[PDB]
Swiss-Prot record, chains A, B, C, D:
Its main location: membrane. Disruption phenotype: Cells lacking this gene become significantly more susceptible (16- to 32-fold) to penicillins as well as third-generation cephalosporins and carbapenems. They have no detectable beta-lactamase activity. The gene is blaC. This is Beta-lactamase. Monomer. It comes from Mycobacterium tuberculosis (strain ATCC 25618 / H37Rv). SUPFAM superfamilies: beta-lactamase/transpeptidase-like. The active site is at 42 (acyl-ester intermediate), 140 (proton acceptor). Its EC number is 3.5.2.6. The class A beta-lactamase family has a specific amino-acid numbering system, sometimes called Ambler or ABL numbering and often misspelt as Amber. A multiple sequence alignment was used to derive a consensus sequence and then the consensus was numbered taking into account insertions and deletions. This allows use of identical numbers, e.g. for active site residues, despite differences in protein length. UniProt always uses natural numbering of residues, hence there appear to be differences in numbering between this entry and some papers.
Length: 265, 265, 265, 265
């Protein structure tokens, strides 16, 4: 009956919807298109920050990174104001999560090092977490513009939910670094119209959004019930049949989240 | 499937839960003990105001009612501040809906006139709406104290939801009086932790609460989707197995509402 | 120059305005009718909670308080829904500050003990803080109704600011109790249209509001600059010349706060 | 008075600050080095779009401009994503205002035509607005690099504020083109930490930023009071004493804006 309502939303919004909520002790898993591939878009910036935190001590966050005007090749609301001043690693992590800063993600990818400007090392980090499906192949802004059917720069709701579960709820990160990642996502400024809009206000929601061409709109979140029980919610969508210029529908993710909230209440 | 989760809420909270959402063109009716009887408690105060509005011209709202300290019997946050000044019919209507003022409802019942302090005339008003099941037999605070199994001062989720549907969405009242009733319910101060707490913030919620002994906690609401689609939600509960002193559980109503929101999303 | 602009606000809004900001190391004191008396209204609920916290160990917050329908004499958005359940001292403190619950303040006054239902003991607590001007003489809701010129239930911007400074910035309370008082005021739900509205968003503002008859509208706040510099802001106003039914003007408090923010910038 | 606090900010941030707020019916002009010259930096891009709108019908917005990677020489977050596709004049206007795209400004200057890549024609356009002082002499990125004392690529807070006043509040443009310019500046992505950060959130702020060498940081804005009263605010700064590499300080402009908001309150 839940798949029937997801299918109605897919028809209402002319979209393909992917939802995954990992099973808990009390609740069964919610799976809609859990193993179909959807484009990361900016959702990769949350595990990216985890990759930077994982392989560096906390003192690395205070390292100052300098860059040029040539490095501003995508939507960079924070980095575009700090070409002359430079940006610390902590500010780049803060910027990548809370403002989805594209230049900040590229600098953090470079901070990981290796082939492809850090894209291979980020994929390797997901592999180390048990994610065998996901792959990052390009930097900003190219990774948002892969045509439908292309497996590059794609993940699945299943894979990204289990990744996010380990980062926030598991022990992929020590408690001090885990709290930083959680606080950045908790103070995100881009997800008000997605999973947060579909859950009651007394539920706590931390999230990282993704938006791209072909109507792509994603939101990955950890939510806590009023009783403090945590859940991982991955919602991914695109409108690829509507072409490159297809508009993303945030209301689709909000409605999908409301459906998920009904089963979790 | 939805009944399994309502019955799970009944089991979690040791309660009997009644839910009714009238069917629309797009949605099927939601029914969970929809025709079982539950005590009105203070939910009758919303149709009571409609009875007063329908029977009287608007100028009747300015009629001054004087009362003494002896007339205060139940929770009356407004009437207790106006013994010396008296209260206009409009103030009694405002107080009865928005603050669930018990003394205000008794004065409005008396304004209806007839046997039982207006309870026969109020019941007759429900009959004019097609509700042949519901009945009011006592005033505040006795109407909250009937033992389980007693049909007096009871309604059903089915009956009260259809009553509210006609008052707010239908044409039981002319538009000017309909707006007064609707705005009072929209600015209610007693329902923040019930149906309002179970719906996402971008859903508009107007409601009237009810609370009594035997763990009785009700909330009747009209809710509007983000796209402006209205739904009537009747949620009733009691915990009679815990005796007269059973405590109402507002969280039961919030969780039940979230389940309803999932089906309506 | 600043007093000329305070006087212009007084003329625009048909109001009497009181402002006090204690001097700091870098900034001089701001005073506009700083020692004239204004009605407390619900601003006393913040030092009231401080008196309860200071006089009792933290574990006292878990004591359950039971009350009756006769105790709901005032606007009590939280207490009115908990007659059957009771409320802990901690919940009453939360309700008194964040929802300005009138019954909760009366129950906390009773917890202080002594003559006048705690009004003498609360006043005595202010005396221990150096406040020789302020006085509480009635409970809710009477303390909001004193006519202009009556010194009862009045304070001054100077005195209430120095009280708030010691409670939040000083050592009137041990750090654990201080954090509870600060967090409650930080999550207050009643002050969005006053001092908070007059300061830039990157300034942190914690506040406790007061509103009454005779156009009375107060807001006492501790504000932190973007650089983390704290200031105490007390703004009090009434429109007593317009009578008992005079409407309070929240915009007066916001505009006055904006004037203060310019001098503190 | 107010000048004493601006000079305080000049000392705190080791900067030269220029402020101008045109007088209105209610307020007197605010002037602090209002007629001293400061470099345009990116602030000319707002009247630049007005020049392009003024000299052409709306259909000119749909003209496609093609360019190469060699034409990208400044911070160009949008133009670097459209080398292969090209961009319409309308997109160039959007990018120049909201993202301060340097390549977009050069293409729009070329669309104005004439010697110096359009700088003479843009200077002539300012003359048509009554601005006899300001001048643009170079393109991006050279216009940010003029040494102190050089009059090239300079304006004054007085002149540009009156220019902005005519473009947004006056009748320099027909209503449809004025609305496009207004909406573009309203949706700017570069000024969150400047004038916008210094005004309360309920003040509407549209702005155009400027940043260059020698610590140059400008922001020209139109702000609306909560009552809908508009004001033009020009805030310019440089820190030439710190050399070419002197860092701009955005907080200076936010603090100066807070000072302005206090007197406009
Ligand atoms: C005898 O009169 N008593 C009261 C009274 O109980 N006032 C209290 C007081 O100071 N309170 C405060 C608060 O903390 O400010 C508030 C918060 S102010 C407020 N009022 C609204 O109507 C609204 O929609 N939003 N907000 C934020 C509620 S009343 C209580 C009163 C209220 S208006 C009036 N003329 N009198
Ligand atoms: C080649 O890149 N194309 C992008 C792009 O830059 N994508 C990134 C991505 O996923 N980003 C995110 C985010 O984290 O969601 C965002 C936040 S989304 C957003 N923007 C608003 O202006 C707004 O008002 N609300 N919201 C929710 C910005 S783009 C970047 C794009 C943006 S819209 C579209 N059709 N394409
Ligand atoms: C919607 O519920 N939430 C509330 C709440 O209870 N609001 C109530 C509401 O509608 N209120 C009203 C009024 O009737 O206008 C008021 C006005 S009280 C009042 N006004 C007068 O003009 C007067 O002469 N006397 N008095 C006593 C304040 S809040 C309460 C709340 C309290 S604190 C907070 N953050 N929310
Ligand atoms: C006031 O600015 N605040 C921003 C911010 O920078 N918003 C920007 C804004 O207006 N944006 C826009 C757009 O141009 O429409 C977009 C879309 S950009 C885009 N659209 C397409 O259709 C497409 O094909 N490709 N791309 C790249 C998203 S946010 C950025 C912000 C970023 S995170 C946050 N909380 N705020």
């Amino acid at each position: 009956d839940l798949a029937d309502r997801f299918a109605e939303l897919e028809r209402r919004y002319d979209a393909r919807l992917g939802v995954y909520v990992p099973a808990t002790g009390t609740t069964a898993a919610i799976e809609y298109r859990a193993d179909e591939r959807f484009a990361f878009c900016s959702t990769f910036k949350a595990p990216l920050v985890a990759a930077v935190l994982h392989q560096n001590p906390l003192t690395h966050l205070d390292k100052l990174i300098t860059y040029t005007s040539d490095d501003i090749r995508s939507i960079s609301p924070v980095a575009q104001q700090h070409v002359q001043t430079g940006m610390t690693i902590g500010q780049l992590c803060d910027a990548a999560i809370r403002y989805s800063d594209g230049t900040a993600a590229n600098l953090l990818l470079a901070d990981l090092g290796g082939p492809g400007g850090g894209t291979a090392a980020f994929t390797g980090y997901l592999r180390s977490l048990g994610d065998t499906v996901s792959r990052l192949d390009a930097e900003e802004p190219e990774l948002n513009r892969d045509p439908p059917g292309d497996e590059r720069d794609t993940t699945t709701p299943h894979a990204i939910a289990l990744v996010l579960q380990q980062l926030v709820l598991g022990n992929a990160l020590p408690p001090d670094k885990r709290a930083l990642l959680t606080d950045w996502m908790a103070r995100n400024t881009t997800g008000a119209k997605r999973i947060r809009a579909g859950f009651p206000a007394d539920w706590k929601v931390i999230d990282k959004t993704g938006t791209g061409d072909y109507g792509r709109a994603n939101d990955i979140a950890v939510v806590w019930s009023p009783t403090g029980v945590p859940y991982v919610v991955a919602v991914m969508s695109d409108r690829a049949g509507g072409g490159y210029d297809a508009e993303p529908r945030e209301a689709l993710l909000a409605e999908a989240a409301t459906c998920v909230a009904g089963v979790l209440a």
